[PDB]
């Protein structure tokens, strides 16, 4: 049955979490513990994944979030108007974010974070102005005022 | 139900406009430009090439010039008047043949011929596709349901610099006397990426799971 | 104090395009179509667009695609130097030791700037 | 060649750094066990068909003298009625548990299990097995050799 | 304080992202097993004294009805000669293997092991156990009730 | 102290073989070649040789291979009950959701004891 | 809904009774016995020892014999008539002094003096407590709010074989002339384990988080 | 000496000391194993290609067919009741222009030892056991084997007492070939199903070989 | 295969465990006060002599009782009974990092005679 | 010795600590909770209060290159290339979670010194890459390498 | 783009940091003895106000100096200067598990005015 | 040579080549650091112990007090505006019969270098930075230090521009001691707060020392 098959596939995915491994936590090891092989691995450019072994996955399509479309437009508009070139974006977005964020966060999440980043790094906005804007935005949502096309204001 | 991404998106956009980095009109203009993008122009370029050997030659040697024939000028079609900042202006058309079949990827990210093909598929952007295609193309293509003779040259094109590609598949059998519209109809987005080949009767990408957005466009 | 020129790129590429706006700035090309080249394993600290999987491999130049600043420089706002970019075709067997002889004609084509190339 | 070798070592090394949400488990309360986890934990370790895995360049492996001897020992124990092959499979490929099942070598499990049946069916006491292991080590240390593995 | 709650939830969550060199093990060859690894893999799971661990805010836990029933069952089985407590400990705290030992709950292991001794000493066939589990599930689904866990 | 019979199996199978020594002990088979059967998801605690990937899937019986105690019983020293074993063919599309229609004829064949089968 | 554990518990119990391994009566009898267990007898043993030097000597040399004075016969109180199968019959009382303070643990599991003290605490069974106490007792006890002079001998007792322990802490100041009942009242379960010391006015274990059960007794 | 060699000696000496099996029994088994190989199975295939009546027998009753190549699944092993782990129910899977088989034991390493010899290291790997049943086309391509998309690829999972050998279709360019000539191109890999017989190819495809610390 | 389910009860009823094994170990090999080192005997499958004590030296403070070793009892082998000793170890002898500030701290635990040897 | 093997063992078994290991491969936005968003966007250097185990603290002999790296970083600040705060932000935060705990303390100081030169365009990335090649060739040719290796 | 490499040295030489910012923050918003709660301001990209302090209340024990907030200084923005306060927190207000046995333990750290609000 | 040494050379040469700093600047800085040590701080404590007026100064204005021992936070460093990373706001924390301090920089390794020297390897570890602020009693016990439960243990987290040194209480058995005698028992560890001064102890507690690959 569909329910049984559903549990079977959920099981096959779940056991992957239990795959045995020799898990060595790294807590700022001394230089003497860093081999050349490790040095190259750590200083690698995160976006360079071609050739790495990976498993087969059932590829899927994903609907576009309104915020993703707006993020894409913002990034191209910033480049259009000279805040940066696309290559500068790629370097900051797909490499500077570091290994953990590179694979732990969503594709467009990195685009957005990096758009905020270029505003601060090139001093078009102070980090204070960004932090302050986020706080104000959150208040906007919490109050019921609504948030543009993401949330309508409070009615009756 | 607003997410941290929606809050940040609003924050970034408002700040950029307040600081005059780009205008509200600019943002609307780009969004509207993107909404006009899709795979139809690329599909038409392939159909036209199939119906005109002289045009096909142009496509293979000068993709940028050939693109103009389907209404997509890589330099002037985008709002910048210097091509999109991320897709650049160097489109190359890869022509399959009885002994050659192409498939495209951007291992470094998601480079895609947006001006003539539209936005990239979610799976095209996946670390998985980017890791495996260049090394196990035969296997990945098989998963997509595509298999070619062992002697045929499968060529994987990795769009790592400023060039963007579209694949011109071999014209399938059973299309004798077909019009341009009829042929363009079977050249789907997947065919232009190279993970599928055109087939009479098939006018849409192969059905696959669709992950829904929290707040879709 | 730092002031960023936000008009340079637009003034330079408008009505022309990118990389068209860099045409002729690389001078004479060091290699030509048909040449066999090996990819030099240059340091990749901080950034590179020449995939690790290509390092030390030998391929065939099939086209001089255009001229442009290397991404390694462009990504950091340095566009004073422009060089030739080449499309290179590698035999899959030369990249992946396990590639099957059954699919001996399979290849991989990608672009690499002149700085990474050396006659094979 | 030397460059390609470094390239391939790199592709294999970066896998160790693959990001993940690593949740250590330290005897969680029953309320932390869902039916999904219950089934996954009580699964039979040898049932791996259908699990996602990566492509690997398959290799042949030269047989170790001790592996040949272990195989003979296990079949001889079955031949002589100490157990049937199914009892061996259950003990060897399942009872060993998830960690040993994939962390130790194929024949290592065959051998551990051969020692196990001797103790579980009381043909030898655990004490006899422990003493025997000590004896073997002393035989090597004393220079008396160890079967065909080490001459005196 | 909602803020403090978020702060502590944060401190616990970042631990999941602690960087590490994660080496998956898929039945490595004997040549990849050093003596150190051999001793670690063949260790008895319950022997944890001296292992490094972090400070945790110790809590009390209410007893589940099934936990009280499991304890009674295990002691009754020993009372009536099915096993001695030492046999139970060996099967329960060691034979279950590393993964189950720390992945499942304390009493979960006690219960699984009570089921295990019934099967290993052949007082019940595995088939009878499997059938009984099926019967219990149907009993619950039918609305027939389940002991003093679920009234009919 | 328990005593184990180490002669039973040899005395029973010598000159006959396994599973030949169980022939006729299962009685009349519940199913026949050609029947469509669904795999029951019976509890798998401690042991089972009916792979998880087959649970709930429907296949076609292509052969009654032999009679034998179920592995679930044999693996624990219980051989008093003997049942029929069937070779079943499954369409790959019915096991793996992602299997391509391009390879519409691919299948998987495996053996399952009668206890796991129910008419489709 | 019933959990996988409750389903299996019923299955195991019914099968055991069905096969005559133990009777339904045996199970009820054991649950009743467990229900009568608690820390009160152990607390009285300590109070009695504080008030009777002769008895204290007995506690220290022969815990089993001393236990009889508080109504707990390790051999005959349990339903077996040969002691509980898991707690055995060799209780030892550890006497603290101005130069020695004990704390107990079972690194291999959760061995506890059930007949005289009741059921073990959830934290006592944790891999965490079993890993750390034997190696960092000073730090663990501090976490519990207990600190002793650096010169005082802290002794960790690891109940790894058939012996079970209870700690007889030193009588606290401020209990002059107190009755046995008054003194026993401040000897909590935690004091008998060794993670706390008796204090006038404190008659319950230190409050700590309580994890609720899905379906409590 | 490794911990494995120490333990092996201990287990063997204890088993013999306790009379579970003798030193002679152990030598008898190793000697039997040394007589095993892929040749008998290859001969069965060659004979089937040259005799339609025999091929029909192979497909219907593998155990009976095996006797023709000198391997009696019941009486050839020292036990006289089949090997304890391989049993006595060999089935031969016949490929055809519309069907191609490949074998695996997802639960372990079940293999037709009596007629084929010992199993390959990779056949025992969790990797092969996890992937083949689900992505056979992909795994076979990795091995260098590809079949038409319309051809039925059938994966046989040896999970119970049946053991299988694959009878590949006779390849082109073998007209007039003798039984020895035909048997010579039916390699172990062809009998497992990860390869197909080819004129001129008489050994398994070269693959990496992991060296043992102390080989036989 | 039949399992004797009355042996333990018939033997320990009215006596207790380990009281029921009293006298079965014979003469003790060590006495209170002796300094003993813990032998690192093989641990395969089961042991109740913690790894953290292996190779360490302690002082016997009491012969607690007689009983079959857990290594045998846990597998249904009770034919042999031996003496169990309560041993006290100096914490500094177990943990290299123990502070000299707490130089009097100790750890007491029980070990069967088989793991002991004169220090 | 026995004790040495005992301690090596206690340390080794830590590698086998069971866990639910969920690899993350660019999850969709719908898989990111606020809790995870905060954990991923956290500044790496803010570790106060995180649970950790007891370790026998040790002193570490100073490497010549560490001594030189420290001096280079303070000299760059002394001469206005950056302020210490800019260094901290780039060095202890911008590097990201993985490098932050996977590489050595001074390794991050050094990488960041190289980083500031490139980010403020005092040197192009090409000049840095070229210089690295230069240092390697200097060593390979036996010309020596500063005070680390005599010719 | 040109970076001013002489600015810092010019204003701090012979004066020091943070002495060179003295008087640039104006009147302080809070005074010694005031009870303040730490606002959980966005931490994106950078912050030097530890997460463990967010939402806790402490006592100001000293106005240490004036300086640009680290959040600005770390990105080359020194245009704004504010007061920094040394704040003392009771350990029990930071860590839920802190023992009442050590009721007087505290933690002292510095936080710029932007994170403070009257308790 | 290591990757670190190669990069250090590359960075240093480039910086000098571009005129960011000179070889002389680098040498001058290494020399300045080389002269740094805990002696100045130890003397400040000893002085405070013998001068009520000075003690008050130390507690109220650490920067001013530091001058008395030859370390001027503004002018002693080569910059003439304090070291870029240690700044110029030293605060002295005075222990008492009811208060004992211990210092850490959870965000990094902030240390009062000008008056104390370079930080200990362990002081910079993620471990120390994670634990001290939450479990100070336990961490100090590991270091061998324990204080009465009623005594206020205060952890100072050096997260901004202030740097601290701890002024421990004067120990028993030092009556009539000279400033030098008193300063001699005030070790680096006492100034951090992980140890207290004790007559007869003139060096930090011995602990493991990890050796460098190429020291000097
Ligand atoms: Co891309
Ligand atoms: Co216990
Ligand atoms: Co198998
Ligand atoms: Co710091």
Measured CA to CA, the distance from residue C89 to residue C92 in angstroms comes to 9
Chain A positions in Cβ-Cβ contact with residue B21 (cut-off 8 Å): 77-78, 81, 83, 119, 124
Residue in D closest to H33 by C-alpha: D72
Which of G82, E76, G193, G56 is closest to G74 using CA atoms? Answer: G82
The CA distance from F38 to F119, in Å, is 6
Active-site annotation holder among J40, J57, J100, J105:
J105
Instruction: Please check whether residue D84 touches H, CB under 8 A.
Output: yes
- Token pair listed for L143: 């270091």
Which whole-number Å values give the CA distances from E10 to A135, B6, D47, J41, J47, in the listed order?
19, 21, 37, 11, 11
Phi, psi torsion values for B15, nearest 5 degrees: -65, -45
Q: For residues D84 and F8, is the Cβ–Cβ distance under 8 A?
A: no
- Cβ contacts of residue J122 below 8 Å, gap of 6+? J81, J116, L14, L15, L18, L20
Residue H58, annotated as binding a ligand:
no
**Chain A CB contacts of F52 below 8 Å:** 8, 11-12
Q: How far apart are CA D34 and CA D29, in angstroms?
A: 11
Tokens found for residue B109: 């990210």
d(CA G197, CA L195): 28
On whether the CB atoms of residues J35 and L187 are closer than 8 A, the answer is no
Torsion of CA G192, G198, G202, G207, to 10 degrees: -50
**Is the minimum CB–CB distance between K5 and chain C shorter than 8 Å?**
no
Rounded distance, CA A148 to CA B24, Å?
A: 14
Does the beta carbon of A99 lie under 8 angstroms from any beta carbon of chain J?
A: yes
L141 contacts in chain I (CB < 8 Å) = 99, 101-102
- Would you tell me the crossing angle of helices J105-119 and J64-78 to the nearest 10 degrees? 40
Q: Quick check: J7 contacting I, CB < 8 Å?
A: yes
The shortest C-alpha distance from D14 to chain F (Å) reads 29
Q: Which of H28, F80, G104 is nearest to D79 (CA)?
A: H28
By residue range, what is the domain housing residue H177? 1-216
Q: Searching chain E, which residue's CA lies closest to the CA of residue F44? A: E130
Measured in whole angstroms, the distance separating CA K14 from the mean position of its chain's CA atoms is 25
**CA dist D80 → F1, F4, F8, H22 (Å):** 21, 12, 10, 10
Assess contact for G37 and G83: CB atoms under 8 A. Answer: no
Q: B138 and C103 in contact by Cβ < 8 A?
A: yes
Domains and CATH numbers, chain E: 1-152 (1.10.472.20)
Contacts of J9 (CB under 8 A, 6+ apart): E36, E39, E40, E43, I51
Closest ligand to D93 CA?
3
Separation of alpha carbons B140 and A111, rounded Å = 27
Distance from CA of F54 to the nearest CA of H (A): 11
Do C and E touch, counting CB pairs below 8 Å (3 needed)? no
In three state form, how does the secondary structure of chain A look? CHHHHHHHHHHHHHHHHHCCEEEEECCCCCHHHCCHHHHHHHCCCCCCCCCCCCCCCCCCEECCEHHHHHHHHHHHHHHHCCCCCHHHHHHHHHHHCHHHHHHHCCHHHHHHHHHHHHHHHCCCCCHHHHHHHHHHHHHHHHHCCCECCCECCCCC
Burial C45-68 (b: 16+ CB within 10 A, else e): bbbbbbbbbbbbbbbbbebbbbbb
d(CA A29, CA A25): 10
State the DSSP code for C12: H
Residues linked to residue L167 through DSSP beta bridges, in sequence order: L94
**Which DSSP string corresponds to chain D?**
-HHHHHHHHHHHHGGGG--EEEEE-SS--GGG--HHHHHHHSS-TT--TT---------EEPPBHHHHHHHHHHHHHHHTTS--HHHHHIIIIIITHHHHHHHS-HHHHHHHHHHHHHHHTTSS-HHHHHHHHHHHHHHHHTT--BTTTB--
Ligand 1 center from residue B66 Cα (angstroms): 23
What residue segments make up the domains of chain F, in order of their start?
A: 1-120
| Residues facing I65 on adjacent strands | I84
Tell me the β-bridge partners of L152. L99
Dig out the tokens for D18 from the structure. Answer: 């693959």
Residue D2 touches chain J, beta carbons under 8 Å: no
d(CA L11, CA J128): 8
Treating both helix axes as pointing N-terminal to C-terminal, what angle do H3-17 and D106-120 enclose, rounded to 10 degrees?
30
Q: Do chains A and B touch (3 or more CB pairs under 8 A)?
A: yes
Cα distances from H138 to residues A56, H143, H146, in angstroms, run 10, 9, 9
Q: In what order do the strands lie in the sheet with G153-158?
A: G100-105, G153-158, I106-112, I82-90, I57-67, I35-38, I116-118
Cβ separation of E23 and A22 shorter than 8 Å? yes
Beta bridge partners of F61: F88
Separation between Cα atoms, residue G113 and residue G157, nearest integer Å: 13
Ligand lying nearest the CA atom of residue K48: 4
Burial letters H74-86, b for 16+ CB under 10 A, else e: bebbebbbbbbbb
CB-CB neighbors (< 8 A) of C53 in chain D: 7, 11
DSSP string, F90-110: EEGGGT-TT--GGGTT-EEEE
Tokens found for residue H4: 């494995």
Alpha carbon distance J103, J80 (integer Å): 27
Which uninterrupted H or E stretch holds E102? helix E97-103
Nearest ligand atom owner, CA of E47? 2
For F1-120, give the CATH class.
mainly beta
Distance (Å, whole) CA L108 – CA J112: 15
Question: Is A107 one of the catalytic residues?
Answer: yes
| Known catalytic membership, residue H190 | no
Residue L206 is given by DSSP the state P
**B188: region left, alpha or beta (phi > 0 left; psi from -120 to 50 alpha):** beta
Chains that touch H (3 or more CB pairs under 8 A): B, C, D, E, F
| Interchain CB contacts (distance < 8 Å): G and I | 101
Q: Which of H199, H197, H196, H203 is nearest to H176 (CA)?
A: H199
d(CA H124, CA D59): 11
**Residue E79: burial class (beta carbons within 10 Å; 0-12, 13-18, 19+):** buried
Cβ of residue C2 closer than 8 Å to a chain K Cβ: yes
Pairing of strands L99-104, L89-94: unpaired
- Whether residue B52 contacts residue B59, with contact meaning beta carbons closer than 8 Å, is answered with no
Distance from the L33 Cα atom to the nearest Cα atom in chain G, whole angstroms? 37
CB-count burial class (<10 Å; 0-12, 13-18, 19+) for B212: exposed
CB proximity list for L158: less than 8 A, separation 6 or greater: L103, L104, L105, L110, L111, L164
**Distance between alpha carbon G73 and the CA centroid of its chain, in Å?**
15
Q: Is the dihedral of CA K64, K68, K71, K74 positive or negative?
A: negative
- Phi, psi at L209, each rounded to 5°: -125, 110
End-to-end CA distance of chain D: 43
- Contact between B110 and B159 (Cβ < 8 Å): no
Residue indicated by tokens 């122009």: B41
Which residues does residue B105 pair with via DSSP β-bridges, in sequence order?
A: B158
Closest CA to G106 of G141, G130, G77, G78: G130
Among B86, B97, B109, B126, the active-site one is: B109
Q: Is C92 helix (H, G, I), strand (E, B) or coil?
A: helix
C-alpha angle K38/K41/K47, rounded to 5°? 95
- By CB atoms closer than 10 A (0-12, 13-18, 19+), residue L104 is buried
Per the CB < 8 A criterion, the answer to whether D69 and H12 are in contact is yes
CA distances from C71 to A86, B161, B163, C113, K30 (A): 10, 8, 13, 9, 51
C45 to chain K, any CB pair closer than 8 A? The answer is: no
Instruction: Confirm if A83 and A91 have CB atoms less than 8 A apart.
Output: no
Considering only CB atoms, which chain B residues are within 8 Å of A146? Answer: none
Distance G216 CA to ligand 2 centre (A): 23
Question: Which residue matches tokens 């890791």?
Answer: B131
L206 CA → ligand 4 middle, Å: 24
d(CA H33, CA B50): 63
Cβ neighbors of L171 (< 8 A, separation 6 or more) are L185, L196, L197, L198, L199
Tokens representing A38 are 């490790």
Output phi, psi for L35, to 5 deg.
-80, -15
Would you call E125 an interface residue with chain F, using a CB distance cutoff of 8 Å? Answer: yes
Q: Which residue of F has its CA nearest to D86?
A: F75
- Alpha helices per DSSP H over chain F: 8-13, 71-74
Show Cβ contacts of residue G135 under 8 Å, excluding neighbours closer than 6 positions: E49, E50, I52, I94, I95
Contact residues, chain D, for H10 at CB < 8 Å: 115, 129, 132-133, 135-136
Burial of G95 (0-12, 13-18, 19+ CB in 10 A): middle
Max CA pair span of chain A: 67
Total structural domains in chain G? 1
**CATH number, residue G127:** 3.90.330.10
Which candidate from D17, D29, D53 shows the least CB-CB separation from E61? D29
Name the H helices within chain I.
7-12, 70-73, 91-94
Q: With contact defined as beta carbons under 8 Å apart, do B146 and C100 qualify?
A: no
Fold annotation for I1-119: SH3 type barrels. (2.30.30)
Annotated binding-site residue? H110? yes
Q: H or E stretch including G94?
A: strand G90-95
Residue H195 CA to residue H146 CA, distance in Å, equals 9
Cα H185 to Cα B103: distance, rounded to the nearest angstrom: 36
Q: What is the DSSP string of J57-123?
A: --EEPPBHHHHHHHHHHHHHHHTTS--HHHHHHIIIIIT-HHHHHHS-HHHHHHHHHHHHHHHTTSS
């Amino acid at each position: 049955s569909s329910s049984i098959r559903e549990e079977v596939h959920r099981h096959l995915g779940t056991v992957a979490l239990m795959q045995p491994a020799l898990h060595q936590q790294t807590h700022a090891p001394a230089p003497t513990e860093i081999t050349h092989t490790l040095f190259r691995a750590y200083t690698r450019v995160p976006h360079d994944v071609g050739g790495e072994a990976d498993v087969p996955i059932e590829y899927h399509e994903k609907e576009e979030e309104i915020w993703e479309l707006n993020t894409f437009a913002t990034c191209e508009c910033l480049a259009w108007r000279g805040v940066w070139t696309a290559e500068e974006r790629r370097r900051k977005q797909n490499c500077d974010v570091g290994q953990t964020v590179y694979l732990g966060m969503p594709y467009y999440g990195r685009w957005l974070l990096t758009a905020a980043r270029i505003l601060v790094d090139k001093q078009f906005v102070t980090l204070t102005e960004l932090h302050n804007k986020i706080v104000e935005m959150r208040e906007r949502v919490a109050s019921g005022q609504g948030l543009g096309e993401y949330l309508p204001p409070k009615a009756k | 139900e607003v997410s941290d991404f929606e809050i940040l998106e609003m924050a970034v956009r408002e700040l950029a406009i307040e600081k005059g980095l780009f205008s509200a009109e600019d943002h609307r203009v780009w969004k509207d430009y993107v909404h006009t993008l899709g795979p139809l122009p690329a599909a038409r370029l392939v159909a036209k090439a199939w119906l005109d050997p002289e045009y096909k030659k142009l496509c293979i040697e000068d993709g940028v010039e050939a693109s103009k024939a389907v209404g997509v000028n890589w330099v002037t079609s985008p709002p910048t008047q210097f091509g999109t900042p991320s897709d650049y202006c160097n489109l190359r058309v890869l022509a399959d043949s009885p002994t050659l079949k192409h498939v495209v990827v951007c291992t470094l990210c998601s480079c895609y011929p947006r001006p003539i093909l539209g936005q990239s598929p979610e799976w095209y952007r996946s670390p998985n596709y980017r890791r495996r295609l260049v090394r196990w193309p035969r296997q990945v293509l098989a998963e997509f349901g595509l298999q070619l003779p062992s002697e045929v040259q499968i060529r994987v094109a990795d769009s790592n610099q400023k060039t963007r590609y579209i694949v011109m598949p071999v014209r399938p059998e059973g299309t004798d006397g077909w019009t341009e519209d009829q042929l363009a109809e079977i050249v789907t987005r997947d065919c232009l990426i190279g993970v599928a080949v055109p087939k009479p009767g098939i006018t849409v990408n192969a059905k696959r799971p669709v992950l829904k957005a929290n707040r879709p466009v | 104090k730092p002031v960023w020129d936000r008009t340079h790129h637009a003034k330079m590429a408008t009505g022309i395009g990118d990389p068209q706006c860099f045409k002729g700035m690389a001078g004479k090309s060091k290699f030509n179509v048909g040449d066999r080249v090996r990819i030099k394993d240059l340091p990749d600290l901080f950034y590179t667009r020449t995939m690790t999987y290509t390092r030390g491999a030998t391929g065939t130049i099939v086209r001089l695609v255009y001229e442009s600043p290397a991404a390694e420089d462009e990504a950091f706002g340095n566009e004073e130097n422009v060089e030739w970019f080449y499309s290179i075709v590698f035999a899959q067997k030369d990249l992946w030791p396990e590639y099957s002889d059954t699919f001996a004609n399979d290849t991989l084509e990608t672009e690499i700037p002149e700085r990474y190339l050396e006659k094979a």
